[PDB]
């Protein structure tokens, strides 16, 4: 019983939702393809790109070493082992590199072993050194060339945008006042004239044939001293390329920055030729400038962009066009392209190591596989994946998370001029790029906008760059519409008519403005290419999960757009009543669940592995159980199917993490009345009905993972044993079987989680002691306890234990580190005071009190409510539509239904009524049957609701009811005392999640203990644990008041000042008197610390001459 609301839908949010990657990587990691085709980008390019390495003597002797087809191959280990043995899920990659001679000699070193190129899981992420990580797609200034106003004082500047931040230099032509036209490549400012001279141009042939209509020239001529002769030119320019290199015309160096596709090349143009052409005086080719022709160079883009400059420095072709952040200028390098460039580096180093081994060694013995030392492609490559501001863990709390995190787009990339946390130009970018296919209500706080998420139907097709959404054009296809697309307007969703949408006023967007109604009304190619396949594409895949976004105010609407990431799978995943089709797909691209393949059949046994689909072949399917989430989410799978066939409108074949039967199910939906409850729901706190705990609802299960390494340090070998000295206390093996704790064991705080003794030789057990020791059989001792034990965090039930030991197979551990015990501990948490509940409309809040069914607000027939969300502020203050969920609530509770009211299309107030209107003729249709009907309490109200001109007067009480049900809802008694709540109190089933933020993990308390031995102030330790921070802000706090003493105490008897510390604990343990300080250590020490530098810090008293007695002990 599912009700849906809506209109059209020509496509689907598209497969899969993890295509940004997945289908990306592969096509960059070609490999899978027969080693013939596949021509560029990805690994191959990097290869071809690194030009066959030569060496001294250009075409004189032996050694050429040309590269060929590479070979990703026989994958060392397997996912799972990798994480178990902390290993990057890599794979070998070698490529035969036949070197040459100049006395004929063809040698092909088969394969030639090489780097380990990390593979990507079916998922769309990586396993690196055990943990799971994700490569987040960055965006930057699209390659090209496009000036921009000189931010200084009015005077447009010219920028040249090389392809990727590692395939060309950022060149800015800057026309100034004192210096004029400058060519500043990387770290070098110089007369722009000079390079031109080299390129041929020159006084007259140059300006006065270029820059006339707009002065800006004499300054370019003056240094004509440079414009007096090329060749000699380079040399002076070369001389202007630090350090003191050898002035000797070489052409090389410039053998780049234009010459050949080496460190400059937008490749076969595409976004360089295909762009500068339609920006400059047309005409161009593969790169900038062109040499190696037969002599002098032949520029292609160095004056025309200078021309087009001046032009916009005083002429008509303005186009001040700054980065213009137009997604027709904002590129996005998908993982594959981030991992590719890195190869475009591993090699950059190999080529060196190769050219070098070339020489030295015997030209007859100098063969490859002996010339190639596979260190570059690794290192620098395995360097990236786990050490990049762009490679990150993985939000794995609830599945939406993971999936979501891949759709995310970082701009905090580490590229060139790539916005630093506050890089040069920040609180400008942030803002909504008028390009809608990279959501507007997602981001967080502080990183406000430098990290956005990309829209649903966004991208998918011939991709050279930038998102590009899908946009209908009258039936048929939907065209992967570019981002620099005008295509004669666009007509927004709605106002249709079979196939001719009869609106004759159709609303549309064109270039920007919502521009009223172009009205082409051609019914033909959708008024050009107008029309958007559904709205969805306007927003983030994980926002579209909001039943009433419409009403929901952007800002707050984002506070739910995120928050709901921080779900936290439970046991009763519950899909939401009002959900939005998406709920059903998000959890099917996450692969967090187990699908099917062909037709039906089953066989199975059910439990640990939905057994073989049984379809023709035979394949068993194991079910991950009580795993561990990067966030400690405990994502397990559930077996759904007994003994049947394929699918029943969906082959869920057993759910996943936080998904009710196939539908994404973050939290639980429950019934709630709105209304201020004696303060317990003050500001934002939600009061809660004990029931939710009694019915094991919000209960979430988390499994931790404690660790211990067995060192070797010079005192004796560190060993993992169950013979912890003295720890006899019938504890040891009262648990800890032959060393480490046992499964199913139950762990409180303090118990030995994984014991291990240690030698340490503090002092020598001198006589007497050794004697007395012998005497009273006081067996001498040499080993310390140094066990593991569980921290002040309660603990839980020992779920499992892994153990890695040096010499083991695929492992490998930190030098010195031998063996490494690991132990997982579960936990099931229910719900307590503290913790957040936050719904889909950013109505976030933390539980305050939890009433017993007894109290609470009894509905009329006795059913208690669930949460007591306060109406104050929250709604008004936040203006949202978390009400149009609570209304289609009972109108779905009683009518017993789950609904689909998608974003910007459905579930309308009248329908919400129609429905609600109904589902009453039963709610109440019953009462007038069970044998009851409206009592003194309900009348007492109704006859006052109309006073509130809230219900139609004249009508019968019964009549006033239904009337007062569509809107709010029944009198709603206060099961606490007994009377009614004067004034109805809208009641309903919302849907509250339980954000990975339970109180437990927070809240600690100190008093003493873990005192430090480096800074001498409470931090780190063993037994107790604790320690609280007292920042500066609080210093002023006390300064501002007058609690001088109260302040001192925080820089005396409570931290560094030992005398004091002890004084304190001695003072209390006794009683009567208090912590008595005097001269804080902080002072006695500052003196005898400045002295050490040759200063005589004197402490003169009241009269200057009463010179202190200080430190006189």
């Amino acid at each position: 019983k599912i009700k849906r609301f809506g209109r059209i839908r020509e496509v689907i949010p598209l497969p899969p939702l993890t295509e940004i990657q997945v289908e990306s990587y592969k096509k960059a990691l070609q490999a899978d393809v027969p080693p013939e085709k596949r021509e560029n980008v990805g690994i191959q390019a990097a290869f071809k790109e690194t030009f066959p390495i030569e060496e001294g003597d250009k075409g004189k002797g032996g050694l050429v070493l040309d590269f060929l087809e590479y070979r990703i191959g026989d994958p060392p280990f397997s996912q799972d082992e990798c994480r178990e043995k902390d290993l990057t899920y890599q794979a070998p990659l070698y490529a035969r590199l036949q070197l040459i001679h100049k006395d004929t000699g063809l040698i092909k070193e088969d394969e030639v072993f090489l780097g380990h190129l990390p593979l990507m899981t079916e998922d769309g992420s990586f396993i690196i050194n055990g943990a799971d990580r994700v490569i987040v797609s960055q965006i930057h200034r699209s390659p090209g060339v496009y000036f921009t106003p000189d931010p200084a004082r009015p005077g447009r500047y010219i920028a040249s945008i090389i392809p990727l931040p590692k395939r060309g230099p950022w060149i800015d032509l800057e026309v100034e006042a004192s210096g004029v036209v400058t060519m500043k490549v990387n770290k070098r400012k110089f007369p722009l004239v000079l390079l031109l001279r080299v390129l041929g141009y020159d006084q007259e042939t140059l300006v006065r044939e270029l820059s006339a209509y707009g002065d800006l020239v004499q300054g370019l001529l003056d240094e004509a001293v440079l414009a007096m002769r090329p060749e000699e030119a380079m040399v002076r320019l070369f001389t202007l390329l630090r350090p003191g290199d050898p002035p000797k015309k070489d052409k090389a160096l410039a053998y780049l920055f234009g010459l050949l596709a080496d460190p400059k090349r937008y490749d076969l143009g595409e976004a360089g030729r295909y762009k500068a052409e339609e920006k400059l005086g047309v005409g161009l080719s593969g790169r900038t400038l062109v040499r190696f022709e037969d002599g002098e160079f032949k520029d292609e883009v160095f004056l025309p962009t200078l021309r087009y400059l001046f032009a916009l420095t005083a002429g008509v072709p303005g186009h001040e066009v700054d980065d213009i952040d137009h997604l027709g200028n904002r590129r996005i390098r998908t993982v594959g392209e981030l991992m590719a460039d890195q190869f475009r580096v591993g090699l950059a180093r190999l080529a060196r190591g190769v050219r070098e081994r070339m020489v030295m060694g015997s030209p007859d013995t100098l063969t490859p596989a002996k010339l190639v030392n596979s260190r570059p492609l690794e290192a620098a490559l395995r360097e990236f994946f786990s050490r990049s501001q762009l490679s990150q863990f993985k939000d794995e709390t609830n599945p939406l998370s993971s999936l979501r995190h891949k759709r995310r787009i970082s701009a905090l990339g580490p590229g060139g001029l790539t916005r630093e946390r506050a890089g040069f130009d920040v609180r400008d970018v942030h803002r909504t790029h008028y390009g809608r296919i990279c959501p507007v209500e997602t981001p967080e706080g502080a990183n406000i906008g430098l990290i956005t998420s990309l829209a649903a139907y966004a991208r998918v097709d011939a991709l050279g760059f930038i998102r590009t959404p899908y946009r209908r054009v009258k039936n048929g296809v939907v065209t992967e519409e570019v981002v620099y697309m005008t295509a004669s307007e666009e007509d927004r969703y709605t106002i249709a008519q079979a196939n001719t949408p009869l609106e004759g006023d159709r609303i549309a967007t064109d270039r920007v403005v919502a521009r009223r109604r172009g009205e082409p009304v051609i019914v033909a190619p959708e008024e050009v290419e107008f029309m958007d396949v559904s709205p969805k594409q306007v927003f983030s895949l994980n926002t579209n999960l909001i039943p009433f976004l419409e009403h929901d105010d952007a800002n707050r609407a984002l506070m739910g757009s995120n928050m709901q990431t921080q779900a936290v799978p439970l046991i009763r995943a519950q899909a939401p009543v009002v959900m939005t089709g998406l709920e059903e797909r998000v959890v099917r691209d996450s692969l967090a669940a187990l699908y099917a393949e062909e037709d039906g059949e089953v066989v199975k046994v059910d439990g640990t592995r939905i057994a073989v689909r049984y379809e023709d072949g035979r394949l068993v399917h194991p079910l991950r159980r009580y795993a561990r989430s990067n966030q400690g989410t405990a994502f397990d799978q559930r077996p759904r199917v007994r003994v049947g066939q394929r699918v029943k409108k969906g082959d869920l074949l057993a759910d996943g993490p936080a998904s009710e039967e196939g539908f994404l199910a973050l939290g639980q939906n429950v019934l709630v009345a709105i209304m201020p409850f004696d303060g317990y729901n003050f500001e934002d706190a939600i009061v809660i009905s004990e029931e939710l705990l009694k019915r094991d609802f919000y209960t979430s299960i988390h499994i931790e993972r404690y660790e211990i390494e067995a060192r070797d340090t010079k005192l004796g070998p560190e060993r993992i044993t169950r013979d912890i000295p003295h720890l006899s206390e019938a504890a040891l093996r009262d648990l800890d079987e032959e060393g480490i704790v046992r499964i199913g064991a139950e762990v409180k705080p303090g118990d030995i989680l994984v014991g291990r003794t240690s030698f340490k030789g503090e002092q020598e057990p001198s006589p007497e002691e050794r004697l007395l020791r012998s005497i009273f059989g006081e067996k001498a001792r040499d080993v310390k306890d140094t066990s593991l034990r569980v921290p002040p965090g309660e603990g839980g039930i020992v779920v499992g234990r892994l153990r890695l030991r040096r010499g083991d197979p695929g492992v490998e551990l930190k030098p010195g580190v031998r063996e490494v015990v690991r132990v997982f501990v579960a936990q099931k948490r229910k719900l307590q005071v503290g913790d957040k509940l936050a719904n889909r409309h950013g109505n976030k809040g933390v539980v305050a009190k939890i009433l017993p069914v007894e109290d609470m607000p009894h509905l009329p027939d006795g059913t208690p409510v669930d949460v007591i969300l306060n109406p104050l502020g929250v709604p008004s203050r936040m203006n949202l539509g978390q009400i149009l969920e609570t209304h289609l609530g009972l109108a779905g509770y009683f009518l017993g239904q789950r609904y689909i009211s998608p974003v910007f299309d459905g579930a309308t107030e009248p329908e919400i009524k129609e429905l609600l209107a109904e589902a009453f003729n039963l709610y109440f249709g019953k009462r007038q049957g069970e044998g009851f009907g409206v009592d003194k309490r309900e009348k007492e109200v109704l006859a006052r609701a109309e006073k509130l001109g809230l219900v139609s007067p004249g009508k019968s009480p019964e009549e006033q009811l239904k009337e007062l049900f569509d809107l709010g809802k029944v009198v709603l008694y206060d099961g606490r005392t007994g009377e009614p709540f004067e004034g109805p109190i809208v009641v309903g089933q919302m849907f509250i999640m339980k954000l990975y933020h339970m109180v437990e993990d927070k809240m600690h308390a100190r008093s003493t203990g873990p005192y430090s031995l480096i800074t001498q102030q409470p931090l780190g330790g063993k037994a107790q644990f604790g320690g609280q921070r007292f920042g500066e802000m609080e210093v002023w706090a006390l300064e501002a008041y007058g609690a001088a003493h109260t302040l001192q105490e925080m820089l005396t008897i409570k931290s560094d000042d030992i005398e004091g510390r002890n004084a304190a604990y001695q003072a209390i343990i006794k009683g009567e008197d208090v912590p008595e300080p005097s001269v804080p250590e902080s002072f006695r020490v500052l003196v005898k610390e400045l002295q050490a530098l040759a200063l005589d810090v004197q402490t003169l008293d009241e009269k200057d001459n009463p010179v202190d007695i200080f430190e006189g002990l």
Partner: protein, 223 residues
Amino acid sequence: LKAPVFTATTQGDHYGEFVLEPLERGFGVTLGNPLRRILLSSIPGTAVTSVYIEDVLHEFSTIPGVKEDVVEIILNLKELVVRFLDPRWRTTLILRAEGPKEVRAVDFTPSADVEIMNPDLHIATLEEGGKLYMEVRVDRGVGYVPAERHGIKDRINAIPVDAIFSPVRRVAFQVEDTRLGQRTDLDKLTLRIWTDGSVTPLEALNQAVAILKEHLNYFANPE
């Protein structure tokens, strides 16, 4: 007047509208509620306390051949409502399951002074390797109690379960005014004392009043 008319459309364990009658204008709740309040709280009942399963060292497990998942079980078993037919005591049902079947709470070994109010009650869909031998407590009790009332017993894998005692499952009450007496002003009660596990409304209602009385009593001698 001088007294009402305590009607009582009863039932068969659960459902128990118990109508007083010409209660003077007001007391419609002075009585109506507390009972209802009390009837949802302080009242003796039956509830599981701990379960032990064949080869299950502790919760967060997974019994082979069984479709389910050990927690579900305990979550399901959390319901199973027993009856005791006896004065003071706790006890331990016991059930072993075979190959392909559907161990619904019913298959819970018949035994002594005990009834299984809620037979059926799909306890576990085991199959192919129907192995399930279990041992669940079931203590007398009152109210709600979780991790505290330790389910020791089979000192080992008790995986103690939650205590959900209160045999009452819902309680409301109307004040419908359509009676005689002396002038159309007074009210007319009718508390329902809805569903239950073992005990019957009348009993809940009855047991209820007692308490309210004993407390009412406490108002004795003051200092």
